[PDB]
Amino acid sequence: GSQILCVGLVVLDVISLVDKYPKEDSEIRCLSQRWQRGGNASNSCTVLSLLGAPCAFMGSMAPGHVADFLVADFRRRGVDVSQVAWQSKGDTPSSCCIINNSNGNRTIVLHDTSLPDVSATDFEKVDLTQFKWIHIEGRNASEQVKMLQRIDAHNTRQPPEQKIRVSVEVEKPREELFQLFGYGDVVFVSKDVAKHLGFQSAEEALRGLYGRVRKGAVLVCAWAEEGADALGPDGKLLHSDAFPPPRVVDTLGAGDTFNASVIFSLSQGRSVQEALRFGCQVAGKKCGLQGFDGIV
Amino acid sequence: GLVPRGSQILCVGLVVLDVISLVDKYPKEDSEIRCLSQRWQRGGNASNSCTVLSLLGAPCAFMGSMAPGHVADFLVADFRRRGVDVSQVAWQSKGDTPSSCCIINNSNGNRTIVLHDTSLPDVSATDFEKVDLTQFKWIHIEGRNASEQVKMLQRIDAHNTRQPPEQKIRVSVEVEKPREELFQLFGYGDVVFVSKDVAKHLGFQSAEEALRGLYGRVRKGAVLVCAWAEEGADALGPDGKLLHSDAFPPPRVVDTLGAGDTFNASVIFSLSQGRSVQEALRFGCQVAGKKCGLQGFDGIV
Ligand SMILES: C[C@H]1[C@H](O)CN1c1nc(N2C[C@@H]3[C@@H](CO)[C@@H]3C2)cc(C(F)(F)F)c1C#N
Ligand SMILES: C[C@H]1[C@H](O)CN1c1nc(N2C[C@@H]3[C@@H](CO)[C@@H]3C2)cc(C(F)(F)F)c1C#N
């Protein structure tokens, strides 16, 4: 019961730092370039390791030079990679990220290689005893529901102090993913998902979606520079203002920084209010830096 | 390994990793869109000409700057996949190996480019001075860092001065960017290639106008070459006779990226084989035309 497991994507982010966002049909020169290990669950693993949490990553990779870069980067961070679902078909996903140096805006052109996703059969072969917390990035919902049903079955057979805490992230406005609201002790819903469901604020989103979560769950919604809100079974709306840096330089992975920090703070026994504040604090600190170094 | 004396064609210039993404619509700032296709391609003028030389059956070598890393590894493996000798690469301790990002809009064919950064130092005259020239029969220089490249050209001239006419290294220069610093390179090389883009920026409306207007800038005996895309290419040598070749357009145009480099490599290859300027022009247009109907460089020969 020592590690935090993150199930989701690992993507090579090919980043270009620009003075201004390029206009269509133009040729602009970038200021600088870097390769960064990306993906939601993968970025959250980076943040958890930097916060001092033992953590593991579970996701699909294909053998090759890009996987080697990613594996060496995970290993450099102290991220346990023993649970990686190695594939025999498809390439590892990669993406072109354009980071605007004047405001930190990040634009992503993702290349989805259509690598097979982590399955419920892959998850069944995992020894759950070493994990205190399991975070699932919503992707292949029907297959992930079976993974969540397996964690529930395990917890059923465990004393309350040995129960694995669960968090779920619904970040894409995909109908298939909305069944994941009913799973996990902590549900993270993105601003994009909230707006696509017609909600104009985090408070509207939380009140409008709480009926979809399981009994006792906490629903969390970060609204970028407007801060973040949480709603638990007591019906009390919790809010944290954002911690914007004076100069926002790189927002790529800000949401993942927030998720990992909320998870970390809750796993340390801190209140939902404290975890919300800590999440914004670390997300804000990150927005003032290129990448994840120096967040702690 | 052992490279036989006077056997290789060297190309000095840029190598870049081109990340090309095809999108249904241009992305709005701060958005996450999925592309239809994404390909990593080795680019750069000297680099593309190297690919074409290898496919034409010429032993060839690339000289350009790279920094150790994963971008360089991909580029090195791509050069090797194309049979390009990479022993002359100027490995750098500072800067990034060039990487560019091209977004192609599938709904209108628009190309948006986020060009590589300028952190990597170019091949210097000091780097070039440490190169034993005996293994090269032809040295082609892609005009970049002009003042440094002039010293490289002056070194090749010094070498040729003490060689019998059959062991003299032939030289070609490409002026492809409309940058003033590059225009001093017109005075170097047995063969000078001037792009349509450079010609138009100097106010020339055709290859004939460009060749007649710029011939005064080349060294005694040099041949000035100007390809004008689907209008074909022209050459002008010391005899004052304008030479022309019509283009050889493919039945369906698929990919024109690297067509100019294909033409340069083919002209160089044909001249290195002892063929006339007229024959080399025609061969250059034939290979450039064949390439335009193909995706990439496979199947050009
Ligand atoms: C997670 C949320 C939490 O609600 C505070 N925090 C911030 N999110 C920001 N986002 C989110 C989205 C990225 C893309 O992944 C864009 C920008 C920006 C800032 C900041 F104000 F620093 F600019 C902050 C903060 N603090
Ligand atoms: C090198 C020149 C030479 O003058 C014949 N050759 C061609 N160049 C073409 N270009 C070049 C430029 C790309 C942009 O990267 C546009 C298109 C097109 C054709 C073709 F007729 F096939 F379409 C041909 C030929 N042959």
What is this structure, in a nutshell?
Chain B: Its EC number is 2.7.1.3. Two copies of one chain form a homodimer. Chain A is an alpha/beta fold and 296 residues long.
Could you estimate the helical fraction of the residues of chain A in percent? 25-40%
What is the overall shape of chain A?
A: globular
Total beta-strand segments of chain A: 15
Instruction: Write out the strand line-up for the largest beta sheet of chain A, numbering strands in chain order.
Output: 5-1-10-11-12-13-14-15
Radius of gyration of chain A: 18 Å
Strand content of chain A: 25-35%
Structural class of chain A: alpha/beta
Oligomer: homodimer
Instruction: Output the number of helix runs of chain A.
Output: 8
Largest interface: A-B, 34 and 34 residues
